[PDB]
Design an enzyme around this catalytic site. Structure first.
Site, mmCIF file in Angstrom:
data_model
loop_
_atom_site.group_PDB
_atom_site.id
_atom_site.type_symbol
_atom_site.label_atom_id
_atom_site.label_comp_id
_atom_site.label_asym_id
_atom_site.label_seq_id
_atom_site.Cartn_x
_atom_site.Cartn_y
_atom_site.Cartn_z
ATOM 1 N N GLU A 35 0.822 -1.196 0.000
ATOM 2 C CA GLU A 35 0.000 0.000 0.000
ATOM 3 C C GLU A 35 0.863 1.255 0.000
ATOM 4 O O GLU A 35 0.560 2.208 -0.727
ATOM 5 C CB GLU A 35 -0.951 0.004 1.196
ATOM 6 C CG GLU A 35 -2.094 -1.034 1.113
ATOM 7 C CD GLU A 35 -3.143 -0.650 0.080
ATOM 8 O OE1 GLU A 35 -3.090 0.484 -0.507
ATOM 9 O OE2 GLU A 35 -4.031 -1.492 -0.173
ATOM 10 N N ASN A 46 -7.593 8.260 -5.412
ATOM 11 C CA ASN A 46 -8.390 7.170 -5.954
ATOM 12 C C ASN A 46 -9.135 7.679 -7.177
ATOM 13 O O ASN A 46 -9.337 8.881 -7.335
ATOM 14 C CB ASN A 46 -9.393 6.687 -4.921
ATOM 15 C CG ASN A 46 -8.724 6.157 -3.686
ATOM 16 O OD1 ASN A 46 -9.033 6.561 -2.549
ATOM 17 N ND2 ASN A 46 -7.764 5.273 -3.892
ATOM 18 N N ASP A 48 -12.194 7.801 -7.590
ATOM 19 C CA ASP A 48 -13.456 8.472 -7.297
ATOM 20 C C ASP A 48 -13.282 9.872 -6.726
ATOM 21 O O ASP A 48 -14.265 10.471 -6.279
ATOM 22 C CB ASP A 48 -14.294 7.596 -6.348
ATOM 23 C CG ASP A 48 -13.723 7.529 -4.955
ATOM 24 O OD1 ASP A 48 -12.599 7.996 -4.755
ATOM 25 O OD2 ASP A 48 -14.381 6.969 -4.050
ATOM 26 N N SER A 50 -11.506 10.527 -3.960
ATOM 27 C CA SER A 50 -10.994 10.469 -2.614
ATOM 28 C C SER A 50 -9.498 10.210 -2.662
ATOM 29 O O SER A 50 -8.919 10.007 -3.722
ATOM 30 C CB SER A 50 -11.733 9.398 -1.819
ATOM 31 O OG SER A 50 -11.444 8.147 -2.396
ATOM 32 N N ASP A 52 -6.149 8.201 -0.421
ATOM 33 C CA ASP A 52 -5.669 7.245 0.578
ATOM 34 C C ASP A 52 -4.445 7.786 1.302
ATOM 35 O O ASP A 52 -3.537 8.329 0.674
ATOM 36 C CB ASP A 52 -5.311 5.949 -0.129
ATOM 37 C CG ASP A 52 -6.484 5.329 -0.794
ATOM 38 O OD1 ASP A 52 -7.598 5.468 -0.287
ATOM 39 O OD2 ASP A 52 -6.298 4.729 -1.871
ATOM 40 N N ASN A 59 -8.745 5.410 3.344
ATOM 41 C CA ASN A 59 -9.477 6.292 2.401
ATOM 42 C C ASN A 59 -10.316 7.394 3.048
ATOM 43 O O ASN A 59 -11.040 7.115 3.997
ATOM 44 C CB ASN A 59 -10.364 5.439 1.499
ATOM 45 C CG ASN A 59 -11.088 6.262 0.470
ATOM 46 O OD1 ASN A 59 -12.303 6.429 0.563
ATOM 47 N ND2 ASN A 59 -10.367 6.775 -0.510
#
Ligand SMILES: [Cl-]
Ligand SMILES: [Cl-]
Ligand SMILES: [Cl-]
Ligand code: NA
Ligand code: NA
EC number: 3.2.1.17
Length: 129
Positions: A35, A46, A48, A50, A52, A59
């Protein structure tokens, strides 16, 4: 802070992630590696909108507030910046909530795609724990 492998392993174990919700320590170390490359300051957008944050790439759509994610929950009651600190307590505490919500660690795409079903124990081999 960029953690060493065994350094992060020992930090996650101290915070109680070893066998948390049945996930052995190597699962959490593996997920952090893929990650964030063990880097508390990691941020990634991300698809969408958002973002991380942090060592486990938590998120802003559901779990923390970063002030720019419309339709955002802040279920860990934390600014997303708190997930970037050298101290991983906020990240670990928030991750315990995520992994307790039904889908276990499948919430971490990198765990699902790169750790799940593998020899996750290697990620803590050689560590003094
Ligand atoms: Cl070392
Ligand atoms: Cl909320
Ligand atoms: Cl707890
Ligand atoms: Na393990
Ligand atoms: Na949020």
């Amino acid at each position: 802070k960029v953690f060493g492998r065994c350094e992060l392993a020992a930090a996650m174990k101290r915070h109680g992630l070893d066998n948390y919700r049945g996930y052995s320590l190597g699962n959490w170390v593996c997920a952090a590696k893929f990650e964030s490359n063990f880097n508390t300051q990691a941020t990634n957008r991300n698809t969408d909108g958002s973002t991380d944050y942090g060592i486990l790439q938590i998120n802003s759509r559901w779990w923390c507030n970063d002030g720019r994610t419309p339709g955002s929950r802040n279920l860990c009651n934390i600014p997303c910046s708190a997930l970037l600190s050298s101290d991983i307590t906020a990240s670990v505490n928030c991750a315990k909530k995520i992994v307790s919500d039904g889908n276990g660690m499948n919430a971490w795409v990198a765990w699902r795609n790169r750790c799940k079903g593998t020899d996750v124990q290697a990620w803590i081999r050689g560590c003094r724990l």
